[PDB]
């Protein structure tokens, strides 16, 4: 199965090499496409040329890349074009052992199947307290009835504890219950000048201490916290104090955009416009997947099929660029002009 996907990628990347008509190809490339096209035309019955020149020869090849790109990602687009018809026999070609694949492609697939079938710690993208409903004014005194210490959110990555003169208490519970962190990196500061319940300025005296799981931590230094230990804040000072604890960043086993090397650009490439014929083609293909057909998924996917698809489409997008194919698509009415930033904007529903 992985062997199949790599072959498809190898072939596509090879078809990209044909930038000109009379250019001398790498002996490696000719050897590959020589077998690939010979076997494809055998099970498909189409006329793809190694050195396409016309346009129909160019389309024929692009169609082949599409047939393979789909067979590999396991997609069935159905009737989307009067010129194109998807051959299901394409999967049989990608399985024929006599068709080699590059080292680059093998190491590319092994990476996708690799991280996709397991988990790993990664710096999460957004603030810790992002999915919160209530937020308080940053730097304002707030003491919940009957408590000597009152921790409260005031930002997407911020919380602020309000301590009474001589008060102490645990705070770890305000963090717990959200996400599933493995380590939360913190850095606390003393709110040297805060507003009181009435509005007057109040100073926080030096002496206020914060200790994690027992050991006392300095102010303004990053602190590796396991999220389980005792986050204790003390105030031996004879006045009202306020300190802010920041979640600079945290790690969790949720897949991020850095699960696969420069996945971001690969995505951007697929989500790019090029022309109407592309826009529609890319969209129509994504309608068969869990991925948003024309706008970057807010949340990075995490399944083999999803990522695998993005790469096959990113590559097929490049194949599109080089071959410059021209064909009809149901519901797509191509504007034959030069294309501007404006026309592309409008194309996105």
């Amino acid at each position: 199965m992985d062997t199949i996907a790599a072959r498809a990628l190898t072939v596509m990347r090879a078809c990209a090499t044909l930038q000109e008509a009379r250019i001398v190809l790498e002996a490696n490339v000719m050897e590959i496409l020589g077998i690939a096209i010979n076997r494809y035309n055998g099970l498909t019955l189409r006329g793809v040329t190694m050195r396409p020149t016309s346009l129909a020869q160019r389309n024929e090849m692009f169609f082949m890349c599409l047939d393979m790109m789909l067979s590999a990602a396991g997609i069935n687009v159905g009737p989307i074009s009067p010129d194109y018809t998807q051959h299901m026999a394409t999967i049989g070609v990608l399985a024929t052992p006599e068709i080699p694949f590059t080292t680059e492609a093998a190491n590319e697939i092994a990476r996708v199947t690799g991280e996709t079938s397991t988990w790993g710690p990664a710096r999460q993208p957004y603030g810790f307290f992002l999915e919160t409903e209530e937020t308080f004014q940053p730097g304002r005194w707030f003491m919940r009835a009957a408590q000597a210490a009152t921790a409260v959110v005031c930002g997407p990555d911020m919380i602020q504890v309000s301590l009474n003169a001589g008060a102490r208490g645990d705070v770890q519970q305000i963090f717990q219950g959200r996400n599933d962190p493995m380590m939360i990196y913190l850095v606390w500061r003393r709110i040297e000048n805060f507003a009181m319940a009435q509005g007057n300025s109040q100073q926080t005296q030096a002496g206020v201490t914060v200790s994690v799981g027992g050991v006392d931590m300095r102010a303004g230094r990053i602190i590796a916290w396991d999220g389980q230990a005792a986050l204790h804040v003390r105030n031996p000072t004879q006045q009202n104090a306020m300190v802010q604890i920041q979640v600079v960043f945290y790690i969790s086993m949720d897949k991020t955009l850095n699960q696969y090397p420069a996945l971001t650009a690969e995505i951007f490439n697929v989500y790019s416009f090029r022309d109407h014929t592309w826009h529609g083609l890319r969209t129509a293909i994504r309608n068969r997947t869990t991925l948003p057909n024309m706008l970057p998924p807010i949340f990075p996917p995490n399944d083999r099929d999803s990522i695998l698809t993005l790469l096959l489409l990113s590559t097929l997008a490049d194949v599109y660029t080089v071959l410059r194919p021209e064909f009809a698509m149901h519901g797509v009415n191509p504007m034959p002009g030069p294309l501007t930033a404006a026309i592309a904007r409008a194309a996105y529903v």
């Binding site: 001398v24 002996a27 024929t96 052992p97 006599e98």
Partner: protein, 350 residues
């Protein structure tokens, strides 16, 4: 430079013994090496096939023949240990099957006469810098390609046949050590090809695309392959021209530049004196140069000119090329031309 091209055609091409035999011999006699080539792509393919048949010939007790996905000759691993003979295919860009292969032959002992990119071909790693025996020297000498040949030779079939190859190693190592001294040491003159071109032979051959640097077509007998493997080369005595050669080299060189010079001045004669040479066309001026210059020199050129064809344009380029080997003749002519620019000094005035 000279390839061991296609191998002739006669119907004796059948004779399976002759064919198979040559198939093995050839994988050790010639270099499909990734550094440089010895044979034609065609010549090699036929060799691999003759070899392929010799392998899966199997006149005696079978082994294990694991055929590969590509019907391509040598896609079979011969059992016990399965030495897949795919490594004995013809990949020029790699060297893979044929001689050399995982060896270094194109090395560079920097200072050497000529500067005609002082490289050195030491066949199968034989850094032959000394007087050979050959009773000694052909001892513990691997070739890798030869070594792996012997493994595949038994893993597949015949010991009796692969044993003849073990006993052959010395005699084979000496044929090559000998060659190196000859190529490398002996034929190192301003007439042996420059390196940037040496390196361009193989890749241009692969590319198919053609440039000036043309391989010579020596068609060979199928059977001669065996005979060559059973014939080492011990040079009885060097050509008598060697000691004198360098002098002769310089003679030719200087003579050439003298011609260039002459032409450089003659060329501009037209824009110079139009009223005299209106009917003048380039062909004219050098036909006069060739005329007043040494015949022996022309002869040397004509070797490839009566074969390749030179255009007036090719000539101009050559004239304009700044590279002249100075001699007494050279400097004097050059200076004569100088004084001779006045024309009143030639005794002909407008």
């Amino acid at each position: 430079q000279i390839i061991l091209d296609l191998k002739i055609d006669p119907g004796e091409r059948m004779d399976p013994a002759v064919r198979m035999v040559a198939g093995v011999v050839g994988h050790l006699l010639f270099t499909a090496g990734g550094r440089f080539t010895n044979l034609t792509q065609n010549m090699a393919r036929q060799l691999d096939i003759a070899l392929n048949d010799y392998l899966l010939y199997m006149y005696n007790t079978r082994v294990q023949v694991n055929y590969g996905p590509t019907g391509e000759p040598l896609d079979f691993q011969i059992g016990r240990n399965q030495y897949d003979c795919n490594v004995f295919r013809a990949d020029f860009a790699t060297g893979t099957g044929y001689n050399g292969w995982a060896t270094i032959d194109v090395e560079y002992r920097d200072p050497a006469p000529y500067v005609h990119a002082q490289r050195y071909i030491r066949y199968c790693g034989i850094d032959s810098r000394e007087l050979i025996n050959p009773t000694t020297y052909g001892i513990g000498m691997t070739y890798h390609c030869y070594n792996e040949m012997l493994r595949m030779l038994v893993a597949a079939g015949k010991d009796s046949e692969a044993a003849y190859f073990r006993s052959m190693l010395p005699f084979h190592m000496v044929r090559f050590a000998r060659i190196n001294q000859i190529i490398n040491e002996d034929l190192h003159s301003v007439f042996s090809l420059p390196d940037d071109m040496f390196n361009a032979l193989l890749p241009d051959l692969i590319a198919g695309a053609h440039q000036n640097a043309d391989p010579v077509v020596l068609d060979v007998s199928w059977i001669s392959l065996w005979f060559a493997f059973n014939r080492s080369f011990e040079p009885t005595h060097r050509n008598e021209m060697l000691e004198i050669a360098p002098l002769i080299e310089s003679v030719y060189a200087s003579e050439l530049s003298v011609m260039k010079v002459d032409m450089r001045h003659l060329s501009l004669m037209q824009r110079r004196f139009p009223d005299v040479l209106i009917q003048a066309r380039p062909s004219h001026f050098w036909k006069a140069v060739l005329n007043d210059s040494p015949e022996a020199v022309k002869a040397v050129m004509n070797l490839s000119h009566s074969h390749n064809f030179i255009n007036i344009r090719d000539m101009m380029r050559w004239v304009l090329l700044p590279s002249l080997q100075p001699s007494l003749k050279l400097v004097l002519e050059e200076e004569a031309w100088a004084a001779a620019n006045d024309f009143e000094d030639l005794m002909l005035t407008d």
